[PDB]
Design a protein around this ligand. Sequence first.
Ligand SMILES: Nc1nc2c(ncn2[C@@H]2O[C@H](COP(=O)(O)OP(=O)(O)O)[C@@H](O)[C@H]2O)c(=O)[nH]1
Ligand SMILES: Nc1nc2c(ncn2[C@@H]2O[C@H](COP(=O)(O)OP(=O)(O)O)[C@@H](O)[C@H]2O)c(=O)[nH]1
Lengths: 475, 475
Amino acid sequence: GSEIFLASKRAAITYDTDPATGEPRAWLAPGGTGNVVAEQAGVLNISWIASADSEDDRRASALNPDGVTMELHSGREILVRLIRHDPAVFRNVQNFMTANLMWAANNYGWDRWTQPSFGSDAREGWADFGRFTRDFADAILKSSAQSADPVYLVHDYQLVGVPALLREQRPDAPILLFVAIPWPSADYWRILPKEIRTGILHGMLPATTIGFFADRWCRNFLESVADLLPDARIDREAMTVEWRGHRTRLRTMPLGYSPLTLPQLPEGIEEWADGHRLVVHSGRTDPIKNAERAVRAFVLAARGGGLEKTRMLVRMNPNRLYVPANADYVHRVETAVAEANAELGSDTVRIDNDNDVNHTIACFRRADLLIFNSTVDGQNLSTFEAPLVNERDADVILSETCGAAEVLGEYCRSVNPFDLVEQAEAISAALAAGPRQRAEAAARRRDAARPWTLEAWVQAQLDGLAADHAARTAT
Amino acid sequence: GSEIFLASKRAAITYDTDPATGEPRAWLAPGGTGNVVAEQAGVLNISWIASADSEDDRRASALNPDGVTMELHSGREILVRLIRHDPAVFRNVQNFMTANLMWAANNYGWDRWTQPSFGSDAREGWADFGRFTRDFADAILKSSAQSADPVYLVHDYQLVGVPALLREQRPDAPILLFVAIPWPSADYWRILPKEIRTGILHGMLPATTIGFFADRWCRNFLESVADLLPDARIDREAMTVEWRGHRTRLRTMPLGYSPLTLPQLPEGIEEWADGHRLVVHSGRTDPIKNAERAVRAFVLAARGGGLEKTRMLVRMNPNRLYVPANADYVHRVETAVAEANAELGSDTVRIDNDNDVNHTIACFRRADLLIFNSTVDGQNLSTFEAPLVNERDADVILSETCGAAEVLGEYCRSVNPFDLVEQAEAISAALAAGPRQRAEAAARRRDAARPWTLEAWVQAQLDGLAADHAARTAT
Ligand SMILES: Nc1nc2c(ncn2[C@@H]2O[C@H](COP(=O)(O)OP(=O)(O)O)[C@@H](O)[C@H]2O)c(=O)[nH]1
Ligand SMILES: Nc1nc2c(ncn2[C@@H]2O[C@H](COP(=O)(O)OP(=O)(O)O)[C@@H](O)[C@H]2O)c(=O)[nH]1
């Protein structure tokens, strides 16, 4: 049985008080990555190291600096250890990670002609990132200090610098890093200042395994390594890097949905949609989700005719609205919806901007057409969840630039997310399709989506790491 | 000797009247590509097919539809054939090629989050591009109808669709296409609508040889082909594409300068720069030339101390100001210059915006520091010309994304064009270096730049085409 040490930016703990006794309670949320790892075969025990990012987390960390054992179903347990970072460092690294810098870097947000223009802010951001990375590595190693053969799983882009620091003190350990966002083309990656574009690669390559959601991101990562590290040797076929002794395997490990996580509609929506076919676009208040272009394409489709009793819901989950790109995105979507309604008629298009998974799942079930047209997406789990819960045989329009398109693209209407005409034509054809044609397409779609579960993805990581560890050990 | 048929967007002709008789005169501008091709050893005759783009051109075409024999020095001649395109098609294709579309496609101008959004105008532009391409192909083929083994050289991005149409009529001919601008990463190239991103590749690949200025553009082109054409097989080491029976060789053929194009400064500039060191940035009114970031970087350097008797000239060559990206570039430069002067003192930074190549060479000669920091550049010939004429041992700051950096980057201060701190440090370092260090660096820089002449570049195309044609025929 393995001794697992999982590191991620957050370990979702629910903090409340008992309804009977009033005593404070802290319990791990179902479906955490730690919860799923804890259930696998060759796992003896598991520790989870994450950042404290609330007063509740901070009190929890201060009470048990070495971590608390928290219970799971089937009498299983997991040692959860929360790191209290320097608040100034932590806040800056959080700003470093948003579209103010690193989110634009990995998610294709810069035009190059006018943005970005790196100043001293980027240099201080990168220094704070180094301090933050050292926080995690020290706490991870301290938590694993007594384990003979610890297995390290590192998750979330915030932790890409961690594998190098673990490797420095644990030369022989299995280390998996999983990157859940895209990796950009080499030319775009090197937009970043020299110390960042190389320093991030120096931090990741000491992992035994680097996983992405999609082949394209593995390829882009390899091309970035070849472009920027003259000392590295990549093998595009074998998906390997050899660099300064480090032998690294890149793997594609798709994730679709969690069965557990995946009710009522939001207030006003059921009656607003009644008697209408309902186009649903859903995603975070993030520029990549592309709802502005979806609304413009819908308007272009409505001009073609055949959409007289069709409405469109833009369902948004508010997130990092303090970032100017996220707020600008919302403003741009609002402007397009306003122009859509002025041209096609009042209440043709509605934005529903609120945080509630249940409401969104209900929007998935109700949808007569689902639009997941991201400009880019590491994977996009909604495009798996939505067909699985939809019972209206809704077609799915899926951007070719989502990682999910590598798994689902043949079973959806695949589109260039920048081409309004193509997207308008896909909306029209999707809504003109007949009942039995959509039934059969949706049947094959759900069959293509169903196998890609959270537990399969965890199993893929462990199996892939064990094989890569064996390879690294013999070589 | 080969029978050459050169196709390009323009055959530069001077229309005037003889100063003694007053008779009308038309004569080829020296240094044109045709002029150079016509002097090579193995060239029996050359015809130059290009577009009519002025009323003088149009009358010239209507009076000699099958071309004018135009005399060169040493009693050589070139048959110049000008195409009268439909005025509407031509004007739209001219616009198709500006930053309104294809210039941003190949020169990295889109942020993806907010631009581009292709509408019907893109579809109409692509149709008009097809009409224009057919115009050229018919004129080229009609001009070579009596040729038993015509050799086709196709230049300028406007003509990228011409190779397929020549190959359709002339299956065994040597065809070279030379692309003088960057080729973008696969992910970026596929921003374009499906019919454009594949159709341009379909039109290019039947060439015997495709030349770019830099290895990076060849690599990106290959990755684009592999991404979009499933029946294509690329070879990154051999620089080849095999597709539908076509074997295409990709070559890097750098160009540096014409020795012929190597006076007084613009009015007021000599006095204004007297008693100061002079930083010079020079380039077209095109966003890729990056003069805004150069000015901001100069201000950062100035804040670091040491630039008290240093001034900055932003020399601009007005071009395509009717395109909103070019006008906005000028607006942003002007804004940066105004803010630089407001902070550092009146008349520290000046823009001189006019069309006068001799004034620009004069600025190159006066410069104490040269900045060619493009966001991207197919090559950039200014960065060869300027050190070759500069006699002040000026350092050169060269963006790592200019194709020229593959030849000269080791001999310049190579910088990330998006990093103001790095560029300001390079400005500071360049202006602090002593005269002996700068003098030896300039001599090595001149030596590296000197071999890359226009004539060497034409010879490289002829030599490369011949080798690739012999290889394609034997196979
Ligand atoms: N917290 C929250 N989650 C939501 C909401 N609506 C949908 N979701 C879920 O958020 C996840 C979105 O994942 P994905 O599509 O990969 O987009 P990401 O936000 O870029 O990671 C899916 O699991 C959705 O079911 C909401 O209103 N609030
Ligand atoms: N017509 C004209 N040419 C100029 C002027 N200033 C510089 N040039 C020349 O224009 C060319 C610029 O080419 P390059 O640096 O490769 O950039 P490009 O403009 O993007 O092709 C060089 O040969 C310059 O010497 C000017 O004021 N007018």
